Amino acid sequence: AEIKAVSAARLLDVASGKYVDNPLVIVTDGRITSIGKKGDAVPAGATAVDLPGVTLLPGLIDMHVHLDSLAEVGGYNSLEYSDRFWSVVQTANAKKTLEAGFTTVRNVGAADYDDVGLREAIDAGYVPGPRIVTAAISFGATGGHCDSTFFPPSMDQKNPFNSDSPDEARKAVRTLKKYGAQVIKICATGGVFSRGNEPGQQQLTYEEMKAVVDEAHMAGIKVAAHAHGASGIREAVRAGVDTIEHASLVDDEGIKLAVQKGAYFSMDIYNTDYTQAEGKKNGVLEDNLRKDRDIGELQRENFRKALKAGVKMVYGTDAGIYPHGDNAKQFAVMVRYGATPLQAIQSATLTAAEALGRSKDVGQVAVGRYGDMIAVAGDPLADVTTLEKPVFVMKGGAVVKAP
Amino acid sequence: AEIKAVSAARLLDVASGKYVDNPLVIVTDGRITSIGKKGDAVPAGATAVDLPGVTLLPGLIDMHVHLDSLAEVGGYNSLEYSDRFWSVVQTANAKKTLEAGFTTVRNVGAADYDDVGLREAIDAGYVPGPRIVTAAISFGATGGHCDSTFFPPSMDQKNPFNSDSPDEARKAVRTLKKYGAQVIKICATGGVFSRGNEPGQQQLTYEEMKAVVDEAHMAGIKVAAHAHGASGIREAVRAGVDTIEHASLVDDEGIKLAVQKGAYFSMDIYNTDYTQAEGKKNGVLEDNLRKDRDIGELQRENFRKALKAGVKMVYGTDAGIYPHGDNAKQFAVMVRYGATPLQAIQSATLTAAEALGRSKDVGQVAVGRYGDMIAVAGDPLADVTTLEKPVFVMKGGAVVKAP
Ligand SMILES: CP(=O)(O)N[C@@H](CCCNC(=N)N)C(=O)O
Ligand SMILES: CP(=O)(O)N[C@@H](CCCNC(=N)N)C(=O)O
Ligand SMILES: [Zn+2]
Ligand SMILES: [Zn+2]
Ligand SMILES: [Zn+2]
Ligand SMILES: [Zn+2]
């Protein structure tokens, strides 16, 4: 067997919020088999990995990434590349994401099953990357945020998964699952980077969303809904959607429903900084930069409000909108908008794994879980920005980065 | 500018076949700007790369690879993977190929523009790999070696580029070029790994092949033809095809025509060793292993004969049939079947670049060419197997591998 014995100054238990001193974490064939103390016995063959002075955390989880997109290629600039360019560069993005300490991610919309292919390649050992929960292709209403909206009718550009009835949406779920979707991503409202809508406009009916949820849940998979507008958020929650992405303009009623039903919010409150700084240079049209400004501050204020009200938060950044590998920059923003460092860390570890239905496998350094860990200098309970520069990353017992 | 100053014990001039002692090769922004002597002046900023005791050669060229295929996944085993799995793993194969010292390769048939995407990603700097000349999708006759041949009619599996008239073949060339083909690959005869044919069976008419060549040549691109059978080889050469792949059962008349017209032969004489050892384990059906045995030794004997007769040889291995990264194993086989080490080396450097129409850019360590080089221990003019374990690889001035 392949055995690593990892020691450090401290380990953060993300469930209890307490530090454990002088941990010795044994990982056997990719799974944590022991969390003891430095100086404890190790099995024969164990390879020592010693990290003096630093603090171990679980591998981090980003619930909202687009690995086959590039922040710097916005707007029509993307048209210059072949289709398979994206299928290839996602490999580099996966590598950057893992090296930043993000050992599990949820890809919530990619082109032509790119993310399914990437998952298969990583899982089989051909290329390095996070454990990817793959949504495959995201969909919603014809003409909506998940459709192609930047072209005239002569070009007849449309998402083949456009769904305009509950039964068509059900069929989309079935087709996506058939070809590798492990979670379903739908567009319940308009958005920032699409054309011909506003974020507040609901785009799927309650009935349409309910059919998606009912079908996904029969197969034991979850549903994530893109939703900025208040009514889209409320109705998605009511329909049983598992996670609400963005959740930017949520109202009191939506917050209350989310608490009642146990829906998670996945709020990408960092990336507006990047968009406003670099979007124009990157090819984003003015109308879209405008919509981003319309929702940026409100989303942050609503994160604070929803957090205070008890809505379960997961860490979702929309990597791809901003550069892959910068995924940890959002922790600080969550703290600025009300979270303790512990809550912010929990959103990308304990709570994220719960929202994935993968608590047995990821999200904590505990016996039975995958040997996915990072180490950071300093005191992450006191300063969450320490997560921006991990000194150590391990995934499935493999050392990705180390001092 | 990015400047490297590379010194070594010797440099092999592949044009003259002579060693140059104590070379100092300066590479500026990826291009060789000087080949002087160790101890010579260097421009300000130059980074020293010193390789004592070893011999520099040009970066090696493999004229026949399939980067989005895997040797170990043969037969129906490939069906278990998603389409984009292949689009991703080609990244790993590209990396292994570069690390083996192969800095330029010609991909002669890939799925759904995989190779075009890979080329774009490498060239833009996202992932490491060789300079890839991309054939995109290979094609020939309906039911032929380039078609899908392992499925019943109910499944209606067919290569969309199947061409059954000169004008349809011309259209295929035009469509392939439109979407990134830099060279055209056609199937002129049956083959080993397809079903329902024998290698000796010609599958495109002279007229069909002539139309392909005429069209490709108008656009200034070349044509490579898969051809085992004698008549397919003769007629492809007569039609003006630039390189003949495999060329396994060439006859006297085909050899004479190839010399007369200046056609190159690209003979993959190594891989039968791998196929006979591992093919069955890898999922290759018995009928195909049989066809491989039918052509293996004859191809080698005909390489010797064609080489002696003066046919211009290029280095083409069919990586993908055997493991990517093992590309240098064929040199020894060429020497066993008549080549001098120099001729074998020339086939993967000087002659290959000429067959690519890229003599100004690759194939030699000379001013103006890309800074693509390897270094090997020992005396490659005396023992070509030294190329199997290069100690140094550089591509576009970037150090890929070094002592
Ligand atoms: C593909 P996507 O739905 O994640 N893109 C979002 C990005 C939201 C961007 N902005 C803020 N969080 N402020 C949108 O176009 O609505
Ligand atoms: C995709 P492909 O045409 O390179 N495959 C060849 C492999 C030839 C294999 N054998 C020998 N060189 N003996 C074929 O199926 O005919
Ligand atoms: Zn969204
Ligand atoms: Zn998104
Ligand atoms: Zn062939
Ligand atoms: Zn081939």
Side-chain angles (χ1 to χ4, degrees), chain A residues 70 72-73 80-85 87-93 95-96 111-118 120-121 124 126-127 179, chain B residues 70 72-73 80-85 87-93 95-96 111-118 120-121 124 126-127 179:
Chain A
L70 292 168
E72 291 181 353
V73 185
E80 297 189 55
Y81 298 90
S82 68
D83 295 308
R84 300 286 89 83
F85 170 80
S87 309
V88 172
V89 302
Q90 63 177 347
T91 310
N93 292 336
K95 189 178 175 127
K96 290 177 182 185
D112 204 31
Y113 303 102
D114 273 347
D115 60 323
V116 176
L118 182 58
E120 286 182 346
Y126 291 94
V127 304
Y179 293 126
Chain B
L70 292 168
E72 291 181 353
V73 185
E80 297 189 55
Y81 298 90
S82 68
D83 295 308
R84 300 286 89 83
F85 170 80
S87 309
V88 172
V89 302
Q90 63 177 347
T91 310
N93 292 336
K95 189 178 175 127
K96 290 177 182 185
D112 204 31
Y113 303 102
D114 273 347
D115 60 323
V116 176
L118 182 58
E120 286 182 346
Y126 291 94
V127 304
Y179 293 126

Side-chain angles (χ1 to χ4, degrees), chain A residues 168-224:
Chain A
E168 188 165 34
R170 184 178 301 279
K171 184 176 180 167
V173 172
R174 291 171 173 180
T175 301
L176 289 163
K177 177 175 68 78
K178 178 177 180 178
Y179 293 126
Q182 297 174 313
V183 65
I184 301 299
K185 172 70 178 303
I186 57 175
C187 277
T189 71
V192 169
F193 293 107
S194 53
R195 183 176 73 159
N197 66 62
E198 293 295 318
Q201 291 165 5
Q202 184 175 341
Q203 291 182 346
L204 291 174
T205 69
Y206 171 75
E207 292 77 13
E208 285 171 322
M209 290 188 287
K210 182 173 185 300
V212 169
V213 173
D214 285 353
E215 185 65 30
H217 286 6
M218 280 207 305
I221 69 175
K222 300 184 186 294
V223 182

Side-chain angles (χ1 to χ4, degrees), chain A residues 64 145 185 226 228 245-246 318:
Chain A
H64 192 125
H145 176 74
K185 172 70 178 303
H226 162 104
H228 295 285
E245 309 305 301
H246 311 301
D318 224 351

